[PDB]
Amino acid sequence: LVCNPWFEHVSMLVIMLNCVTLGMFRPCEDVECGSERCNILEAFDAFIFAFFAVEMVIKMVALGLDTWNRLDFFIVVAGMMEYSLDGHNVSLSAIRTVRVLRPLRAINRVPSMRILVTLLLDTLPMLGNVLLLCFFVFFIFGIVGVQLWAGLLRNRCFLDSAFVRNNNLTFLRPYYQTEEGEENPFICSSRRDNGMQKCSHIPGRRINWNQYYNVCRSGDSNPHNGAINFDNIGYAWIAIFQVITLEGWVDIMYYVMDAHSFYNFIYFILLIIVGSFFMINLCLVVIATQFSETRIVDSKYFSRGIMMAILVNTLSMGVEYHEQPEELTNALEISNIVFTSMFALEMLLKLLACGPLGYIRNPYNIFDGIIVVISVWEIVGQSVLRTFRLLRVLKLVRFLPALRRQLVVLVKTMDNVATFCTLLMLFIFIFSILGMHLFGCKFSPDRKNFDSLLWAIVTVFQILTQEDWNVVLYNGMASTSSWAALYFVALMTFGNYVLFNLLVAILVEGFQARFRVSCQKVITHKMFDHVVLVFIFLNCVTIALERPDIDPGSTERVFLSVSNYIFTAIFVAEMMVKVVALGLLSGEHAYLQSSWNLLDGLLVLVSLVDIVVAMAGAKILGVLRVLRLLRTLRPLRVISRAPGLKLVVETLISSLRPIGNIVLICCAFFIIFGILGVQLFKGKFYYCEGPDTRNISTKAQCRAAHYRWVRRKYNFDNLGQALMSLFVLSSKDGWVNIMYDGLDAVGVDQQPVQNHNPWMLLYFISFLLIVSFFVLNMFVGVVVENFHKCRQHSPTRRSIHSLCTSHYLDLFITFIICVNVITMSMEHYNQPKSLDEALKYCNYVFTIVFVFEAALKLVAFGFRRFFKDRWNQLDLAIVLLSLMGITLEEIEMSAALPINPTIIRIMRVLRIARVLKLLKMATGMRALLDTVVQALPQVGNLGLLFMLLFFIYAALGVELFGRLECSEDNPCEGLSRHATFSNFGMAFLTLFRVSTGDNWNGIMKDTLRECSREDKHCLSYLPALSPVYFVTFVLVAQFVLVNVVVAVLMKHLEES
């Protein structure tokens, strides 16, 4: 019965049968239970439970009163409750949600999965240290957010009560709301606040009603159906969690900037650094570390000739595009006829030399033969075979040894990843059926729904990639309850920060297992570089003061104009002195013998050319614009002058060499899928834009209805457009929308129809899964190479003294502060007056208790000894700080009111420093932070290279996108009042949003849209430069951040 191993196979068969019965559940067609199919399915489910209820009985009898066995017991008893409770209508359906755990029983039946899970469960205990750091971040930023922005997002511009009452009119809405309704609220700034958005910024009517919305008072709803707000600690953690995932975090920032103050970007910048970067990547560091701790044909010319035949054919395939000329189409087919014939000619020649048996011996020769038959078949059969022509690129593997070796390594990586992938599908399946139970037909239908298994799996996969996952969150919270946020928190936490970091650990472990004399002296002077470095910094200020809105006749323009001439002269003289002392190129140690010296030479050369053009009252405007773009690279001269920056830059370039082959393979995949996408989707990404298009079906009807026929910004018209779309897909920002266009594509001059071709999910999901694999091997390649480099390199006083030295006092304080932590979270918006008194009295008790601790500490150790410890200094600071805050509060109560409420608010917010005491107790957490401290010297320079990259692109963006405008005639999708390149200050802030990858694709869309005909000073070739600006910034910015993750990872390993 149980001894026979085939019994487990019988059990496994039933488990899979129980996975299918769960997958055929229809959310809102089975609840009625009135259909015949449901009736048989329920009987099927009952039969399955009988087996497992029986099987548990035999196992208990044979073995009597294994963690997995406990889980099996829990499923049976929970299911029995549901089955036995039948007949009671009180939350019967709600009890039916427990069956989603049944697929977990498959973990124990598969030995490979069980071992992997057991290893995973053994690493969780070491993640508590990271979990504590999460509590500090969420708790600290959860109160500061609540104390500041409690109830401010309810603000709306209301009509005056006297105005409406006296005039006896009520046709108007009570408060201003755009025609979109509550979906785009207009949050004003109260009179006592200094928010950016005021009730006087209301656009006029388009006699004027909008001018009478001039009262900003609290409304009755927060943004997103009440989902986003800081009214209490519960709602503040939902906002903070969304910021940590970097999805829609700018939207939350703009809400509080519009309501409280523009200087709230400091709060979010620290959160994105402390929590979103370090805290979330320390999870990867800890997991990865812990896992590791547990005759003519053979001629070279003939081979080269065949190589170029394949390569040229591949290039010819990617020259197609929309509205292709007829002659070009004919030429391509003729080219295909020639190339396939040439391959056929090689097919015959090799067969004769080696014979039919000899040819089959070579494995690659087999693949070549399979290609010739289809190529000839296509001609003889004269369109599905056309898409198969892309397999010809695989022939190049024969002649590329570096890539052939690399592909073997990647292919071998699938053996280790196979077990993890099976565990991931189970994780996605369980959460997919759970979502249908909770959000079944509740999203009244949105594309991101749980109405069926197919679209429940796609929505769960989409959430894991963190793309519009907050849009689904708001639907879930509004539809069922605000506590539905736990579904997304658990899905995103167990999935991204636990399971994905386990995949990284698997891969990392697998791979791991007379005048000239004067000049010669001056440049060699110790302070020469420092003197020059001062001038470079002053030249950076001049670059950062440039902006479009400078009046040419103002004194600022002439000041900037003159400063350029001086700096050009200064850097020419510095170059001139150096060349004299070293010689241009003739000498062995000549000036241009080093790349860094050469880099300067180009910069000085361009400056001189700029002067000449400026000297020339001629048609040289186009040239002037280009020189202005190259003049933003001047800050690059800082690297050579700073020894620390020079070393880190040289290290980043070296790190690229080990992963050079992966990048080449990744670049080849982009082209293969880019050409594939063009064939499928070229000419099908057009749509009719109008208020009502339910009757439009073709282009002609769109024109007849007097609407506009417009093309998507990201399309597959040609290989140029396809590569830009694939990069946006790979970046996982805006990748869902591009997928929707592919699904809805119908044909040329045809209106897209929703979910027209669901089979296109394979094209988009496959690209994301494969690319994410390549990008993961790049991270592992850098980690492995770095590790290789590291390896090769009085009686009344005595009683008090006993108490203070004893651990009892420390544990007593830790309890008091814990209570204060709970008390500090009791506050909320519009709390009852009784609570204010109760919380105030609690403050009195804590203040005196802390005061007694200081008094006892002083006597036990003494004034000089007590001040020695840093912890005691921290305690003194807060107690002094706490007394000051309470004193001001009492004066505020008193009749005298000279204290500005701003001071009282700041003191209340700064009272949270009491939590820092627990930092002393958490010995484990402090050690984890100490790992980051030891990595600061390596991480500090990487931060200097991050700010240097920001400066060059921030100044370059202002020159390019400085004058772009947003208006109702030319609406923008990514830019707004908060996101602009108007000045260097705004460009710097916008690039921070882009680096985090939050709606950075919408910003590029704004630069690709054609400028108005009437508008002037529009760059004709801006749409060509925008992809280069955003692609290079994204790749360079992400590489630097990855190397910061590796730097901390190395120190964690070498420390243990």
Ligand SMILES: CCCCCCCCCCCCCCC(=O)OC[C@H](COP(=O)(O)OCCN)OC(=O)CCCCCCCCCCCCCC
């Ligand atoms: C240290 C934390 C780390 C993880 C944080 C991740 C985010 C957690 C979000 C989960 C909490 C969701 C509840 C939020 C909330 O307050 O809303 C619920 C409820 C309003 O919703 P109704 O549908 O009942 O509307 C009623 C309308 N009158 O809010 C309340 O009224 C009070 C609920 C309790 C407030 C929160 C106290 C507990 C702290 C959050 C619980 C989550 C813990 C995470 C482990």
Ligand SMILES: CC(C)CCC[C@@H](C)[C@H]1CC[C@H]2[C@@H]3CC=C4C[C@@H](OC(=O)CCC(=O)O)CC[C@]4(C)[C@H]3CC[C@]12C
């Ligand atoms: C990248 C390797 C692996 C393959 C080679 C790819 C090329 C064949 C691609 C890259 C850029 C493509 C071009 C990008 C943009 C255009 C403009 C497009 O529209 C026009 O020519 C505009 C006409 C007008 O404005 O009047 C026609 C296709 C064409 C030339 C594309 C033809 C195919 C090109 C040259």
Ligand SMILES: CC(C)CCC[C@@H](C)[C@H]1CC[C@H]2[C@@H]3CC=C4C[C@@H](OC(=O)CCC(=O)O)CC[C@]4(C)[C@H]3CC[C@]12C
């Ligand atoms: C180390 C480098 C980056 C130098 C330090 C940076 C500064 C040069 C930046 C930071 C803040 C910037 C300022 C932020 C805000 C403004 C207002 C803004 O004014 C306008 O655009 C016009 C407003 C109006 O006319 O009402 C742009 C210029 C200025 C002074 C910016 C000029 C450049 C500043 C001083």
Ligand SMILES: CC(C)CCC[C@@H](C)[C@H]1CC[C@H]2[C@@H]3CC=C4C[C@@H](OC(=O)CCC(=O)O)CC[C@]4(C)[C@H]3CC[C@]12C
């Ligand atoms: C460690 C901490 C997080 C747990 C202990 C703190 C709780 C006792 C606090 C946290 C937030 C408080 C809530 C914040 C806001 C509200 C809403 C308030 O008004 C409403 O119920 C209206 C809600 C609406 O209109 O949406 C009633 C009290 C209540 C539930 C509070 C009750 C007490 C709560 C749950």
Ligand SMILES: CC(C)CCC[C@@H](C)[C@H]1CC[C@H]2[C@@H]3CC=C4C[C@@H](OC(=O)CCC(=O)O)CC[C@]4(C)[C@H]3CC[C@]12C
């Ligand atoms: C291989 C992966 C890592 C991507 C690498 C970057 C590409 C996404 C970039 C490199 C060059 C870019 C192209 C450069 C120029 C153009 C022409 C541009 O159209 C015009 O120039 C017409 C308007 C005008 O005349 O200015 C459309 C985008 C496109 C194809 C760009 C699309 C995005 C491309 C392919």
Ligand SMILES: CC(C)(C)CCN1C[C@@H]2[C@@H](CNC(=O)c3cc(Cl)cc(Cl)c3)[C@@H]2C1
């Ligand atoms: C660059 C690195 C240092 C390696 C970290 C990058 N990662 C961080 C981030 C997550 C987003 N989520 C997914 O990619 C995803 C997709 C599926 Cl199907 C299942 C699961 Cl569990 C997760 C990525 C990639």
Ligand SMILES: [Ca+2]
């Ligand atoms: Ca996004």
